[PDB]
């Protein structure tokens, strides 16, 4: 079941952005989340991602699972100016959305989506 806390953003026609990391009260940093602004127009999210397998790890043990990581950051981009997020790092949630059992193809649409205002949250892999 999909149980994300997602706190309904309302985006007002506001021209100044930071990516900020967002839900830093109540989340656990084991999650980091970076909220995406657009800027102008809507141009292609700072990182990158591919897939693999993540350990997830459970009171069960070390469980894998199909991850969907990060491949590379845009030098310049949002993600990587803010020394917020890094390479490593595997992405769990996008906006809300689970990438859990979700492709690249839709993931990356999801992303490109809600692209004014985006949620991202990944996990610290603390550089693997």
Same mark, same amino acid.
């Given at each position: 079941?999909?149980?994300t806390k997602a ?16 839900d830093?009260?109540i989340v ?24 693999? %397998? ?27 100016? %803010? ?46």
């Amino acid at each position: 079941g999909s149980k994300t806390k997602a706190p309904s953003i309302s985006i007002p026609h506001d021209f100044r952005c930071v990516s900020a990391i967002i839900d830093v009260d109540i989340v656990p940093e084991t999650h980091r989340r970076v909220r995406l602004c657009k800027h102008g127009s809507d141009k292609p999210l700072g990182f990158y991602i591919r897939d693999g %397998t993540s350990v997830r790890v459970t009171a069960s043990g070390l469980e894998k699972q199909p991850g969907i990581f990060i491949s590379r950051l845009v030098p310049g981009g949002l993600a990587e100016s %803010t020394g917020l997020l890094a390479v490593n790092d595997e992405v769990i949630e996008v906006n809300g959305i689970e990438v859990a059992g979700k492709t690249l193809d839709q993931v990356t649409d999801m992303m490109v989506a809600n692209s004014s205002n985006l949620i991202i949250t990944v996990k610290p892999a603390n550089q693997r």
